[PDB]
From a paper:
Using a close homology to the cathepsin protein family—sequence identity between silicatein-α in [name] and metazoan cathepsin L is 52%—silicatein’s mechanism of catalysis was modeled. It is suggested that, analogous to the hydrolysis of peptide bonds in the cysteine proteases by cathepsin, a catalytic triad composed of Ser, His, and Asn (a serine protease) is key to the polycondensation of silicic acid by silicatein-α.
The tertiary structure of silicatein-α, occurring in a crystalline form in vivo, was measured in situ by serial crystallography and realized at a protein crystallography beamline at a synchrotron. In this work, a total of 3,608 individual diffraction snapshots were collected in cryogenic conditions from 90 different needle-like spicules extracted from the sponge [name]. These data were sufficient to generate a complete dataset with a resolution of 2.4 Å. Using the known sequence of the most abundant isoform of silicatein, silicatein-α, a well-defined electron density was obtained allowing the reconstruction of a continuous protein model from Pro3 to the C-terminal residue Leu218 (except of loop Ser175 to Gln178). Surprisingly, these data reveal that the postulated active site of the protein—the catalytic triad of Ser26, His165, and Asn185—is in an inactive mode. The distance between the hydroxyl group of Ser26 and the imidazole ring of His165 is 3.6 Å, too long to allow catalytic conformation. It can be hypothesized that a rotation of the Ser26 side chain into another favorable conformation (a distance of 2.9 Å to the imidazole ring of His165) leads to activation of the enzymatic activity of silicatein, which is also supported by an additional hydrogen bond network including Gln20 and Ser186.
Numbering used by the authors: 3 to 174, 179 to 218
The structure:
């Protein structure tokens, strides 16, 4: 298809704000999982980024100071589940791990990594599977203060990436990415990024999604 948006399938939750906590990895990872789960199960369940922040330090994440999607997925697989938000809510900072099995919202068996730099493989993932976790270069003041339109940056790097989000669709040529800086940033917390511009901002350098 020429354009998808996974809200069409009820596979995307509201926009979140990570506050002053540097945990996009978590928000980005949970976002893909929420989608995959909502598609399969038919019910959208909000999942807990706080769970990932508190409990994935031993898998090699840094709580509120940063981390990866991969390492968040390993935690989910090894811990055989992630709690949902309702019962494990965002506090804005690293707290004790209160992971409880009774509130396990979702589980998974692995992650598929999209071939680094390939946007046609990325589109194929997004169209045929679901929302895909990505990371980008959001260094620019233009990104930091993006408000509307298609982001099409000349200064963007395709290798050293500093911010993670969920691709929830694409259209016309852009990607539709969901950020976690709350609803007052971008287009309702969304950004439309440049599609098929030879991997601008490294959108397809480190894309993945979970299996379940």
């Amino acid at each position: 298809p020429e354009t998808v948006d996974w809200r069409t399938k009820g596979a995307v939750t509201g926009i979140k704000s990570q506050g002053d906590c540097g945990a996009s990895y978590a928000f980005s990872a949970m976002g893909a999982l929420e989608g995959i789960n909502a598609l399969a199960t038919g019910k959208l369940t909000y999942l807990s980024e706080q769970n990932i922040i508190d409990c994935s330090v031993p898998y090699g994440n840094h709580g509120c100071k940063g981390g990866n999607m991969y390492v968040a997925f390993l935690y989910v697989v090894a811990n055989e589940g992630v709690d949902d938000g309702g019962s494990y809510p965002f506090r804005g900072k690293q707290s004790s791990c209160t992971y409880q099995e009774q509130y396990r919202g979702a589980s998974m068996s692995g992650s598929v990594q999209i071939n680094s730099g390939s946007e046609s493989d990325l589109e194929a993932a997004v169209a045929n599977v679901g929302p895909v976790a990505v990371a980008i270069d959001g260094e620019s003041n233009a990104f930091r203060f993006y408000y509307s339109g298609v982001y099409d940056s000349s200064r963007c790097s395709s290798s050293s990436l500093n911010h993670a989000m969920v691709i929830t669709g694409y259209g016309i040529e852009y990607w539709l990415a969901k950020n976690s800086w709350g609803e007052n940033w971008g287009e309702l917390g969304y950004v439309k990024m440049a599609r098929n511009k030879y991997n601008q901002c490294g959108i397809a350098s480190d894309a993945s999604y979970p299996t379940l």
